[PDB]
Amino acid sequence: PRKVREFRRREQEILDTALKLFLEQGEDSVTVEMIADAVGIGKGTIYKHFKSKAEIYLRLMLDYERDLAALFHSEDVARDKEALSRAYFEFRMRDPQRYRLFDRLEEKVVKTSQVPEMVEELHKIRASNFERLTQLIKERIADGKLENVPPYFHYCAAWALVHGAVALYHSPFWREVLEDQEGFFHFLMDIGVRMGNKRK
Amino acid sequence: PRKVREFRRREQEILDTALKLFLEQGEDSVTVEMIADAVGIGKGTIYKHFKSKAEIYLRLMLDYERDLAALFHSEDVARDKEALSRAYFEFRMRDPQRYRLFDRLEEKVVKTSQVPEMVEELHKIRASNFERLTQLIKERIADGKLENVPPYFHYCAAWALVHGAVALYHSPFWREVLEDQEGFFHFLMDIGVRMGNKRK
Numbered sequence: 001p002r003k004v005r006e007f008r009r010r011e012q013e014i015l016d017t018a019l020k021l022f023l024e025q026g027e028d029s030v031t032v033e034m035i036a037d038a039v040g041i042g043k044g045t046i047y048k049h050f051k052s053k054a055e056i057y058l059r060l061m062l063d064y065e066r067d068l069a070a071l072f073h074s075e076d077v078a079r080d081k082e083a084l085s086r087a088y089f090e091f092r093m094r095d096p097q098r099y100r101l102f103d104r105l106e107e108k109v110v111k112t113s114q115v116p117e118m119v120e121e122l123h124k125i126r127a128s129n130f131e132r133l134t135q136l137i138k139e140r141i142a143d144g145k146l147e148n149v150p151p152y153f154h155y156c157a158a159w160a161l162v163h164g165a166v167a168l169y170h171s172p173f174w175r176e177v178l179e180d181q182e183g184f185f186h187f188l189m190d191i192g193v194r195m196g197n198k199r200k
Numbered sequence: 201p202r203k204v205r206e207f208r209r210r211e212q213e214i215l216d217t218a219l220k221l222f223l224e225q226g227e228d229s230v231t232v233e234m235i236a237d238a239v240g241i242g243k244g245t246i247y248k249h250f251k252s253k254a255e256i257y258l259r260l261m262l263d264y265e266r267d268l269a270a271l272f273h274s275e276d277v278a279r280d281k282e283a284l285s286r287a288y289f290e291f292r293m294r295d296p297q298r299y300r301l302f303d304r305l306e307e308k309v310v311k312t313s314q315v316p317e318m319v320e321e322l323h324k325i326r327a328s329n330f331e332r333l334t335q336l337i338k339e340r341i342a343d344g345k346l347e348n349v350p351p352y353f354h355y356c357a358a359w360a361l362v363h364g365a366v367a368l369y370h371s372p373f374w375r376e377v378l379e380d381q382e383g384f385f386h387f388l389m390d391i392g393v394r395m396g397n398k399r400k
Contacts, residue, residue, distance in 0.1 A: 147387070147390075149383070149387055153383075153384055153387050156368055156371075156374075156377075156384075157387075157388070157391065159364070159368065160361060160364030160365045160367065160368045161360060161361055161364055162364070163363075163364040163367055163368075164359070164360030164361055164362070164363040164364030164365075164367070165357075165360040165364075167360065167363050167364070167367075168356055168359065168360045168363070174356070177356065183349060183353075184353055184356070187347070187349055187353050187357075187396070188357065190347075190396075191357055191395060191396060194394075194395075194397075195391055195395070196387070196390075196391055197394075199394065
């Protein structure tokens with residue numbers, strides 16, 4: 001499996017390197033040559049790893065859902081809720097600058113020359129994760145922690161917050177909160193986990 | 201006297217009439233001529249009370265803040281919290297399409313070199329309202345309701361939600377949330393009043 005493991009290493013750095021390159025400067029402002037030079041493998045191996053620039057885009061967005069999927073222990077026997085729900089909220093807001101980037105890339109790629117094999121593969125896992133989210137809510141309404149209301153009361157709520165906070169970390173002058181301020185983050189985590197919780 | 205009250209009818213009604221027209225039709229798709237006929241008076245009549253269409257915009261946004269100002273009963277000594285905290289959120293989300301209308305209207309022409317005589321009054325009234333909000337936040341940490349963290353931790357949360365919900369009340373598929381479910385509102389109300397509260 002040795003020829004395999006160094007393939008995955010080379011491929012991963014190119015993915016980690018590239019993400020900084022889009023997040024730094026600009027999403028459109030990078031090319032394979034910049035990513036090739038940032039890793040220094042001379043624009044030929046990266047070609048073998050990923051055929052096009054757009055392929056890296058979705059491979060990032062695919063892997064983003066793979067980790068959110070991996071966060072969901074996916075086997076729903078007992079296990080601790082809330083804490084997984086916290087791991088959810090921590091995950092959604094961990095890189096608000098990355099969040100808005102991925103929205104741009106889906107709006108970019110899907111309309112313009114989408115490589116649909118990964119786009120159509122993507123929506124499947126996104127809809128698969130959505131199911132696991134609504135499932136996570138139902139188990140939490142069953143225990144009695146969360147309030148007994150339709151699960152789209154909640155999944156829309158958990159969506160409205162995460163959409164607003166990322167809009168906070170972005171639109172105005174709140175560059176104070178964006179960097180450091182781990183007491184707003186863990187405060188914001190407690191906001192989501194305690195959102196809709198029942199009080200007698 | 202009797203001579204006074206009839207000024208207020210035209211101004212109030214035409215503004216109340218007009219506000220509905222933008223939300224139904226479009227903010228830019230309407231003109232004073234339609235608004236003159238929507239209540240059925242001469243355009244010349246509207247002209248004396250209100251100068252141009254673009255100026256009509258801010259008088260709504262001013263009155264929206266004028267009512268929010270009146271809501272914070274700094275006149276009153278007692279000062280009932282929580283219900284005022286709900287009255288805040290109830291006020292902010294009662295017309296989420298109007299919030300985006302005012303947000304969109306600010307994004308539109310009024311921001312760029314149009315009737316600034318009215319524009320700076322808004323910032324003054326908005327910044328004055330901001331004071332009463334952060335004041336209400338601090339007073340509620342005094343009682344022990346909110347968690348003891350810097351008082352704009354909460355104003356940032358309460359802003360991120362209200363920005364997300366308005367984006368939800370605007371989300372593509374949610375035509376039910378506005379009129380079918382009145383129980384989603386009271387769900388968010390219990391969410392807002394109980395947002396950031398301290399535990400044992």
